[PDB]
């Protein structure tokens, strides 16, 4: 056994040799370890408390004596002193924890389990003694010095990262809770109590100073660059000389000071930068404001208002010319969408909220713009879209390239997605598809198939079921034409060539033709085809409208031969001219049974082309109001440069008539569909408030056509007069089925 006073002199000399680091040898280390070991194993029966008391007193005395050399120092000098003394103290205490390791494992561990909190591991005793003799009196000075060094580093200068990293490492390690040194993770109790709080409350002051000293004398365009640089720079000073847990708090505080405090100046510059379309700075501003959660809400409103206003200005620039030129209008809307879609996809990083604001902006724009207000109806926009879509697929002189045509039809479908009243587009496209398919005016059938498939992908199947039935009816009619040609070759033939395209009455929206006198050869051809038709499949009927059928006649009575193609009405009138030349309008009406208006327009076209003369050529030709007593005489001296000249060109007064007939038909279709929808709704509901009922109808039909409240009141009046949707007894609010 060895008493403490017999060994404490040598042990104290050795520990003082450790702290005043003079490059000790391992022999002295093992002599010191034997000195601790030979005392802790000698004979309230566990020796080692006295040695712990002398170690605590020695470390307290050493740190109190060390403090007197650093209390007067300030700024860089006290920080250098603290970091050098902390590194030396930490290393020499890590040595002392190995010297007094036996007391660290078999008395400190023994007396820390049995309560007795207040005695710690010798290393953790050295940190606690550091936390009470050289950290508390040098806390404010050192943290002020490192704050000033951070100020000098932020101001643009270069400063030592080693000193700051040493101070921050000391502040992190000093946070070791003494009561349970066997803790989990790194302890930051001291760190976020004397430095992180002070540094994080001083960075607020320094960035509010840079903000309202740079934003005052520089535009916001440069301030965004400076703010992005500062945010990256404080992402840098968490990994250089700070702790990794200050990253989130520091980035959040820098965002709240640089951005959130001055978000009121970003919005007033958002419109200015959007007007000049500086896409790079828009991307920089979105990348800056997006860090502020819930602050992006005002940017979407400004963006959608600007997109709507810019589109409205573009459509106003189109003016009256866009009404009669569908390509210009659709190209203007498409160009606005293309310009303000890259700005959302590239600058705004294709954000869901921003692309939703773009979609909502054009929805209020394509349906209701200057050209629609000029036509006092929102149906002019999908009608113009349908006209443009018909113009691309029409057989022009220059056929469009198939890849180019597919791309521009996809662009049209992109425009179509924002059309509110898709029903008007459906009806107009159906009629244009009819007028193209019955005349073989389609540029390419695969283009039509692709458009039908894209419409199918866009809006259900009932939207384009009629169109698909029309296309398959065209195919079936082609097969039937081939079969009738084979039958004509087999059976008795017709001198007149015959080529029909039989179409379903359910599809192909058309108008039933007026009464018509069938020519004798045409009567024979009609009877032959009906015989073949009954031979194939009999139990049905055919309407035989001659409004959209043509053919060419040989003018042998003329001075020169002609192969002039003419409509069936015009074919009958020319046959009547062949039978007798002198012929009156009243005779035309009573023999050909054609209605007077359409027959008058036919005669107007015939006089317009100078196909044959009237009873007086010197009278009005293109502006004559023909009367039943007007006589028309065959003119054999008609001259033209070509023989296959077309007289079946459309007349100017019928395009608008078909347009308004389409509007009436789609209005009746709207009425029928909303009647059926409200019937289903009241079948599933059986009682509902009036405004709730109209809201339910609007939400139920919103996927295909947004209804109008006066039309809803008209159809509900029709149904309440029809007892299908009758009123319940004595109520003005609700009713029952």
């Amino acid at each position: 056994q060895i008493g403490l006073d017999q060994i404490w002199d040598d042990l104290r000399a050795g520990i003082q040799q450790v702290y005043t680091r003079q490059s000790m040898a391992k022999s002295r280390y093992m002599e010191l370890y034997t000195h601790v070991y030979n005392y802790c194993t000698s004979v309230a029966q566990f020796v080692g408390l006295e040695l712990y008391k002398r170690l605590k007193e020695f470390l307290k005395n050493y740190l109190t004596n060390l403090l007197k050399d650093g209390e007067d120092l300030m700024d860089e000098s006290v920080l250098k002193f603290y970091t050098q003394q902390w590194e030396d103290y930490r290393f020499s205490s890590k040595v002392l924890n190995g010297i007094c390791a036996y007391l660290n494992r078999h008395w400190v561990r023994r007396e820390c389990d049995e309560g007795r909190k207040g005695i710690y591991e010798i290393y953790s005793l050295a940190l606690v003694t550091w936390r009470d003799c050289l950290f508390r009196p040098l806390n404010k000075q050192v943290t002020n010095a490192v704050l000033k060094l951070i100020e000098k580093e932020r101001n643009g200068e270069t400063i030592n990262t080693r000193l700051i990293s040493g101070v921050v490492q000391s502040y992190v390690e000093l946070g070791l809770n003494e009561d349970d040194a066997f803790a989990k993770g790194p302890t930051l109790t001291v760190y976020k109590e004397s430095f992180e709080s002070q540094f994080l409350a001083d960075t607020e002051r320094f960035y509010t100073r840079e903000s309202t000293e740079f934003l005052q004398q520089n535009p916001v365009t440069e301030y965004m660059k400076k703010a992005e640089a500062r945010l990256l720079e404080e992402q840098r000073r968490v990994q250089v000389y700070l702790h990794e847990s200050t990253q989130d708090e520091l980035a959040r505080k820098c965002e709240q000071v640089l951005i959130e405090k001055h978000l009121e100046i970003f919005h007033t510059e958002f419109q200015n930068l959007l007007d000049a379309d500086k896409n790079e700075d828009l991307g920089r501003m979105y990348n800056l404001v997006s860090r502020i959660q819930d602050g992006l809400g005002e940017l979407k409103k400004l963006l959608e208002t600007h997109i709507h206003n810019q589109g409205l200005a573009a459509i106003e620039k189109c003016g009256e010319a866009a009404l009669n030129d569908p390509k210009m209008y659709v190209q203007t809307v498409l160009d606005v969408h293309k310009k303000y879609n890259a700005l959302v996809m590239s600058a705004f990083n294709n954000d869901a909220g921003f692309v939703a604001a773009l979609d909502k902006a054009c929805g209020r724009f394509i349906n209701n713009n200057a050209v629609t207000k000029m036509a006092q109806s929102s149906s002019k926009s999908p009608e113009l879209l349908a006209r443009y879509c018909d113009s691309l697929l029409k057989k022009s002189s220059k056929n469009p390239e198939e890849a180019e045509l597919e791309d521009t039809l996809n662009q049209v479908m992109v425009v179509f997605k924002y059309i509110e009243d898709k029903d008007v587009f459906q009806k107009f496209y159906a009629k244009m598809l009819a007028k193209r398919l019955v005349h073989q005016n389609s540029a390419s059938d695969d283009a039509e198939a692709s458009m039908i498939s894209k419409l199918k992908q866009a809006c259900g199947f009932e939207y384009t079921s009629k169109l698909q039935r029309m296309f398959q009816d065209i195919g079936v009619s082609k097969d039937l034409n081939e079969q009738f040609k084979k039958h004509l070759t087999n059976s008795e033939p017709l001198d007149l060539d015959f080529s029909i395209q039989v179409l379903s009455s359910g599809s192909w929206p058309f108008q039933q033709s007026c009464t018509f006198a069938l020519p004798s050869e045409l009567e024979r051809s009609y009877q032959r085809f009906t015989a073949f038709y009954a031979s194939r499949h009999s139990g049905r009927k055919l309407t035989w409208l001659y409004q959209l059928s043509k053919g060419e006649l040989v003018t042998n009575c003329f001075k020169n031969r002609y192969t002039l193609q003419a409509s069936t009405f015009q074919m009958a009138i020319l046959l009547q001219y062949n039978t007798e030349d002198a012929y009156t309008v009243q005779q035309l009406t009573d023999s050909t049974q054609i209605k007077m208006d359409i027959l008058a327009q036919v005669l107007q076209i015939l006089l317009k082309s100078k196909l044959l003369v009237l009873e007086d050529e010197n009278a009005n030709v293109d502006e004559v109001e023909l009367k039943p007593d007007t006589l028309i005489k065959l003119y054999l001296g008609y001259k033209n440069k070509k023989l296959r000249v077309n007289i079946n060109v459309p007349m100017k007064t019928e395009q608008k008539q078909e347009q308004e007939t389409t509007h009436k038909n789609i209005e009746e279709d709207r009425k029928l569909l909303i009647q059926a929808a409200i019937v289903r709704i009241m079948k599933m509901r059986k009682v509902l408030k009036h405004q709730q009922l109209l809201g339910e109808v609007l939400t139920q039909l919103s996927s295909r056509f947004k209804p109008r409240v006066p039309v809803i009141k008209k159809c509900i009046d029709i149904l309440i007069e029809k007892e299908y949707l009758e009123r319940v007894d004595g109520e003005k609010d609700t009713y029952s089925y």
């Binding site: 039989v502 049905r540 060419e552 003018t555 046959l575």
Partner: peptide, 16 residues
């Protein structure tokens, strides 16, 4: 003595 060579037509098939 007018003569017609080529003629096409369109008819509406209605189910009875």
């Amino acid at each position: 003595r007018f003569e017609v060579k080529k003629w096409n037509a369109v008819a509406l098939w209605a189910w009875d």
